[PDB]
Amino acid sequence: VETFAFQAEIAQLMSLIINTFYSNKEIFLRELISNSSDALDKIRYESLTDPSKLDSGKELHINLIPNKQDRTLTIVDTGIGMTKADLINNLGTIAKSGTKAFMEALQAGADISMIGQFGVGFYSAYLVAEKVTVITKHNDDEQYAWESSAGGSFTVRTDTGEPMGRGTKVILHLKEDQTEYLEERRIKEIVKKHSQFIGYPITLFVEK
Ligand SMILES: CC1(C)CC(=O)c2c(C(F)(F)F)nn(-c3ccc(C(N)=O)c(N[C@H]4CC[C@H](O)CC4)c3)c2C1
């Protein structure tokens, strides 16, 4: 397990998201599903010139898995997944420009629901989550586990749990006062009003 510091701009963005009073928190799910949809676009597009990239799984879908007892909401896709370089450097590098630009806008008057147009929608997960775990598998790399409870640091480590084949699992350890996002009626309402035009099956896993 390696520990890394966030870039100052990203760390600043996370502090803002965690400690700003913002009631329209449900937008986190639209942003995470948009991330999955982009990941699925990319693997499908690349498979058009190299069909062997789908040997790790041909189905392209998004699963939403709430867990009331663990107080976790998990978003699973079979998209392209992320490499070690993605998790530690490349995505952060791209995010720096959008993050800084996003924090300017937050002072021009723009509100938090706009985070998506800056390419940094993933970090909206910290509106509802005290800790975020990302399990991801790219065709050209091993399975890795990313985790952060904000505070300016994050960890990456090789994962040894069950293999995923290919794709990304985002595990939101929900805050105490945010368990409404574990209710199936609530999840269905958010999906239908923010993400009804996603080009892949979105499946809600009902708890038994
Ligand atoms: C690396 C992170 C842990 C922290 C991060 O900063 C970040 C960001 C960023 F804010 F930079 F935009 N985005 N982001 C993230 C999170 C889930 C996914 C998905 N569900 O696959 C994702 N998709 C691909 C889509 C196609 C791209 O070619 C590569 C990514 C990206 C993360 C996860």
| 1: exposed, middle or buried (Cβ count in 10 Å: 0-12, 13-18, 19+) | exposed
From 17, 61, 91, mutation site for ligand 1 pocket: most ligand atoms within 8 A of C-beta: 91
Asked if residue 43 has its Cβ within 6 Å of ligand 1, the reply is no
> Among candidates 93, 73, 75, which has minimal Cα distance to 85?
93
Output the DSSP codes for 108-135: HT--GGGGGGGT-GGGGGGGTEEEEEEE
- Asked if residue 100 has its Cβ within 6 Å of ligand 1, the reply is no
Elucidated via:
X-ray
| Beta strands in 49-152, from DSSP E residues, in sequence order | 62-67, 72-77, 129-137, 144-148
Q: Which two tokens stand for residue 177?
A: 């006062």
**Residues β-bridged to residue 204:** 64
- CA 80, CA 36: separation in Å to the nearest integer? 9
Index of the ligand 1 atom closest to the CA of residue 120: 10
Q: Strands across the sheet with 62-67, in order?
A: 2-5, 153-158, 144-148, 129-137, 167-174, 72-77, 62-67, 202-204
Nearest Cα residue to atom 12 of ligand 1: 120
Residues 6+ apart with CB under 8 A from 59: 78
Task: Give resolution, Å, one decimal.
Answer: 2.1
Residue pair 147/132 in contact by the 8 Å Cβ criterion: yes
87 contacts 66 by C-beta, under 8 angstroms: no
Q: Whose CA is nearest to atom 9 of ligand 1?
A: 120
Residue 75 structural domain: 1-208
What total number of domains does the chain contain? 1
- Whether ligand 1 lies within 6 angstroms of the CB of 134 is answered as yes
The reply to whether ligand 1 has any atom less than 6 angstroms from the CB of 115 is no
Residue 61: partners with Cβ closer than 8 Å, 6 or more residues away? 40, 77, 78, 200, 201, 202, 203
Residue for token digits 């010139």? 49
